[PDB]
Amino acid sequence: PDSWDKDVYPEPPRRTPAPAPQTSLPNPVTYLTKIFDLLVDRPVTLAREFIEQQHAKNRYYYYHREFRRVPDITECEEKDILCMFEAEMQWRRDYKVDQEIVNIIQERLKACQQREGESYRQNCAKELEQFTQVSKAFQDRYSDLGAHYSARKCLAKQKQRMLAERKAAKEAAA
Amino acid sequence: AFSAPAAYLTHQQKVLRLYKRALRHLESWCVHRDKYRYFACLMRARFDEHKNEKDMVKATQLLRQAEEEFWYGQHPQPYIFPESPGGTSYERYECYKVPEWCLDDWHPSEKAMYPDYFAKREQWKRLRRESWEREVKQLQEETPPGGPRTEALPPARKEGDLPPLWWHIVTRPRERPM
Amino acid sequence: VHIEPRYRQFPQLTRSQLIQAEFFSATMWFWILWRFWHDSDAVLGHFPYPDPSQWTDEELGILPDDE
Amino acid sequence: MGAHLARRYLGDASKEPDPLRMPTFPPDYGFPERKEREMVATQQEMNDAQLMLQQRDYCAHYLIQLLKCKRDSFPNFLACKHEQHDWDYCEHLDYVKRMKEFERERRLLQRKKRREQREAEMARG
Amino acid sequence: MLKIIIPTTMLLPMTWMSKHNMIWINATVHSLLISLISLSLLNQLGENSLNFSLTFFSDSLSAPLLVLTTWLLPLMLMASQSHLSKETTTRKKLYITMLILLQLFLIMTFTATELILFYILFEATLVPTLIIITRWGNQTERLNAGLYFLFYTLAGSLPLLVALVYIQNTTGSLNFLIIHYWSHPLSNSWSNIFMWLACIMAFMVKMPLYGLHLWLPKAHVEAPIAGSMVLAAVLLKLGGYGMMRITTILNPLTNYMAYPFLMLSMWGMIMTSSICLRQTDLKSLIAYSSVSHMALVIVAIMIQTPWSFMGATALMIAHGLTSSMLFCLANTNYERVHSRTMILARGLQTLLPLMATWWLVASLTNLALPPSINLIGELFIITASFSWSNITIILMGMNMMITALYSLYMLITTQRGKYTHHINNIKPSFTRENALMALHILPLLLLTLNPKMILGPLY
Amino acid sequence: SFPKYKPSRLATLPATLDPAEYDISPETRKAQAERLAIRSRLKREYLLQYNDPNRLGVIEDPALIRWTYARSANIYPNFRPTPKTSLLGALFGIGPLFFWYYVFKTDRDKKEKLIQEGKLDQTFNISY
Amino acid sequence: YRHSIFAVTHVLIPVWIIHYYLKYHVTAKPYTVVERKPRIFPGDTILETGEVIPLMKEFPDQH
Amino acid sequence: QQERDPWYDWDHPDLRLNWGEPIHWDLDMYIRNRVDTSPTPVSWNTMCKHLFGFVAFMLFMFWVGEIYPSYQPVGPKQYPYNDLYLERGGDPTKEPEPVVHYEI
Amino acid sequence: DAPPLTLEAIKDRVLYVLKLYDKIDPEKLSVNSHFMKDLGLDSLDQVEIIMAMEDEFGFEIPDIDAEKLMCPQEIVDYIADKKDVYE
Amino acid sequence: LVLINENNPLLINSIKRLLIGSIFAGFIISNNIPPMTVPNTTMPLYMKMTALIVTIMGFMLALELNNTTYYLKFKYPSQTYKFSNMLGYYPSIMHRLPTYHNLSMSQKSA
């Protein structure tokens, strides 16, 4: 369906085997499926057709808000309240977007496990690696900021991480 | 339940209660009727053997030893009648017992749903209100100056009187109210 | 149907309940016998249990002690 | 349940096998030319059939055939007796192979005990 | 926020100018209208707060508390009109005036943007409460209860005033936005330790913290029904709100200074649940349940993680509603029999069916029964405490077991069994009482339907 | 003979096995008579109030009032700091606090040591 | 008549509402309804692409 | 109150109390819904000894059975592809140490 | 559930049990006969009679009340009052 | 007074419906579910018959011990009988001791 993006939410092609009956006995599942189609599917399809006809007469649109980029807390001067405000709001929006990214990856993982069923350990290794990488990066970014997290605290954590990486590189080169 | 208790249990009362308790527990042990009849006859034979005993000290010692024997040999899970205090059907209908004072708080429409019952209820209420002074006078005339020495109450000594403190005994909820 | 209480006597029964109880007991026993006739392996086993003592050292790949 | 437990516990644990360490001898020790077990069902076939990991043993092809037979004749749930017997027989053969492995381990252990006792006796004498 | 502040200041002259028999009707109707208007504050932003002006601002933490206060006022009016029938017109109007003043102070307290204005308002809330308790309480102990409440709160709050003026002199501003943006780490020194202690101890006494809590049973037992409703529902939440606000500037010292308070809160949660197990008074049982739940909230705020803050806010709202409902039910029983003893009246299920239903629902919510917001908050706090350490789960499990025990014990004692024989003045429940219980309980289930409205800014 | 029954505090001695039940002094009988007289006087008072047709309300129970008062409001005026009370209070109010403090501090110190040494399994711990 | 009225209301109306809700609302967001993929056996005909999954090799048949 | 007489005409039948009689300090815990101190057919010490003995013996025998387990005279079960290396989540890039099962 | 009891039914059943007692002569047994003054039984016999009535009607008579039931009419009245029989 | 009566159609029909399942439901359910576990095809005969043998031994021993109840012989209960009948003494101790201590500390201490 065009409701969502297939590239963002991938689904493997569906391979349904053709029925190969070996007995003359009638299939109760087939008979009940025919009954369900006759009694339920047709009336609900007619109702949805009427509703969609009524919708098409009043077609109106809504838009997605776009935020232009602004200088971040690194560029802001010390105790420059306006630049700090803009940078903090931008960091909070980025935090929300990153959280939704992790949510999308987790949904991929869950859906793939359920779809694979009994062979999930081998067939879901591709989605497990992506989740591992994304969770690792997200944890390193926002792991222990606290209840009163802020762009300044995230920047301080990044500075500490960069100093540690530089020290490790120097020690390895020594 | 309906009888006022005494200050103490005499020796006869103690031995009779022990006899009944032993018979009940023996019936619990001997499930079948023939076996129970045999062993109950033997138990009454023991009681009759010790029945004639002039020495009250010896009689009390026999009672004490019999009580110890009973406690050792009692059934861990004796049979209890369903309505009896230990029974499975005990206190099951206490949530269905509603009093008449609760009855009189009805709405006039609800009362009008039962026109004949409430006429007789009003008659009973008039009878209760017309007798309370005579009841309290009778109670305070017959009491000793020190106070009530027991929990028993007197009957109605007069032709037109009702026994004192009768309302709740007479109007207690039925054993199967709803 | 109304069944009157009996005092010190065997209670009144009904042909319907008698025949129903007999039919269901007979059904249980017929089912047990019929299933035992067809698939008795579910109770008595299906494949023989080998005796390890009868397996030869040649087929178990055991060399003679001296060798 | 069995006599092997009695022999191992109330007896010589050194001569009786250890189930958690078996095998302790090389597979070719005593077998000049020993053939590796043949697997009929492929990894892709088992993965597509979604056999549980416990069911993906060397008898997997018979299980796959039984599942296919059961799916096709659905209303008649008594029409797969031959496939069921084939799968059960393959499982029986696998079990007797495991029993042969246990017995081989046991008699190899007791042969080793006899050999080492003989060597010790020779060294003493 | 003036669109909500001014209608209360107009509730004042309307109450004083209305006729002698229309005071309750007018106050109730217009309080409900003000609550409806205040429902519009729940539309919050994901980035920052609602900055109305230089004086008042609203956030995801302030909005549900304001809605709870505004919704709580008419319920207090209904209970008060229950128990103040024979009062004179002037004293009825004074009672309504004290309630209105308390609501106005609470609204401005939750919406204040400076710490010093917040302090002034949250200390001003004591005067109407003290007057209500010590004037319209029933028993003798109301005077001692008022003294205990007043002096506990003031002894807590005066060092907070000193610390606030010191912080303003040091940093230049007490505005919450400025101190959030210009926050700096707190070095480990004795001076910083004592500043931390001053602020935290003020709000811990307001919470209350275990060992600082005797004023709570004293005041809640001896206050009138409206005083008990406001004391448990809202006034206990000022401490939690203050702690969730001031701890911005107390880091990283909170990591080291929180041990005594966490140990006190956990052990006192266990102790107050156990106390509830053996209480001969119904109001005291409800008060100690309040102490236990607020101890849990203190644990959440002290461990101070995004999952704990959401749990703290949800538990605060849920406890406010549940404790208010429990106090109302106990007061109806008291109005029947004129005594607070739990075992005096029994069989109230066979004498009053619908009240038995209300008792069952309130007691089920008092324990964490899923999917109620009580359970949502408690579960979030328990999860955050588990990530903090792995024996907090032991303590929380013990607390949950004892909470279920005493809640169902209270229900079984009051409702089930056989009715007391000599108590023959138990008239059928009033439509007013039933409507009060319904108005307590239905919003809680609606909040369960929509839980993101009470999870705070960290959601 | 038969094994004896040893009473406990949670499994008390039955009346039928109590030695004082079979040794009745004449003063015991008058004590029982006095007890029955007290009970009968109280029962008469309660029954008169109970059956009074003009009574509406609750028959106040002085015993219940005394019990509720003695349980709460009479404890502090009758409390004196004794060695027993001081030791019990110190134990029950301080020992648990420091026990839990030691437990939690030790656990968190070990966890922080593992975190610093970088050998703690913190993968997937996204929520905190 | 009573059973007919009961069957249409209590069974027909809920199944209509639930099928409408699932087909057009729930199955409109990704991953809301996830079906375990069908089992494919050797010698089968995949209907999506008209594909023939081949049979297994010859078994070493016994008895 | 459980020890109290059930057949007496108490003023409060459920609590088994009379109006005006002194109330035990621990009535809140000695009600019929709570701690029961009524006599038992067996002595408390005997009951404690028997219960502790049963539970301790069961724990000891569970440990003994753990150190002397029960099994069958069979070898380990065999799986085709390196004990199902890939199926159990193994890394396709790395080459597993081969596991070979032979006929017997 | 069960059919209600009646005074005549209670009297018939108690007299039935007492006539099935061997120590009581059926001919001279009337509803006003005293178990000891004019029937010649003793305390143990009265205890057994009360136990038989308990087994007959399926409920227990407390020992405090059972000691005073010295007449079949007294037993009938006691059982009727306990079971709430008025006809 | 025999009030035994079981001729109610509701009771008979409900017991009938649950009686068919107790005979045939196991066969249908076991034969319709897919094979989700490896069967134990090969095992010694005495192990195959262990369940039936122990069930029959229990039947016989319990039946004999119940038949001995008809004898005109009386004997006091054993220690094992008291332990078994009184639920292993677990409810007594574990419902009187921990509850007493907790409810005592809840008032004396807290």
Ligand SMILES: CCCCCCCCCCCCCCCCCC(=O)OC[C@H](COP(=O)([O-])OCC(O)COP(=O)([O-])OC[C@@H](COC(=O)CCCCCCCCCCCCCCCCC)OC(=O)CCCCCCCCCCCCCCCCC)OC(=O)CCCCCCCCCCCCCCCCC
């Ligand atoms: C700290 C110890 C921890 C132990 C942990 C392990 C526990 C294992 C439990 C074993 C089973 C115990 C069964 C009896 C317990 C209850 C006793 C009782 O009071 O019953 C009365 C009760 C009757 O109640 P009632 O109608 O109220 O009558 C009251 C009595 O008249 C009142 O008269 P009473 O009081 O005289 O009646 C009791 C009396 C009469 O009951 C019996 O005799 C029951 C005998 C059961 C069968 C035992 C022999 C089984 C032989 C099997 C042979 C074939 C093996 C398989 C291989 C075949 C091919 C080679 O029992 C005894 O005197 C003792 C019986 C054996 C006790 C075993 C536990 C020992 C505990 C520690 C030692 C205590 C010693 C001192 C005792 C106390 C001081 C005096 O009995 C029954 O209802 C049925 C009893 C049991 C029937 C089933 C027996 C077969 C199933 C269990 C045995 C295993 C069979 C093989 C299984 C598969 C293996 C692969």
Ligand SMILES: *P(=O)(O)OCC(C)(C)[C@H](O)C(=O)NCCC(=O)NCCSC(=O)CCCCCCCCCCCCC
């Ligand atoms: P009626 O008014 O004639 O009653 C006659 C009485 C008994 C009152 C006598 O007048 C009397 O008091 N006689 C002297 C005292 C006396 O007889 N005492 C005997 C009582 S004990 C006795 O010796 C018999 C007891 C033996 C049985 C004990 C029961 C133990 C086994 C119980 C086991 C329970 C389960 C099996």
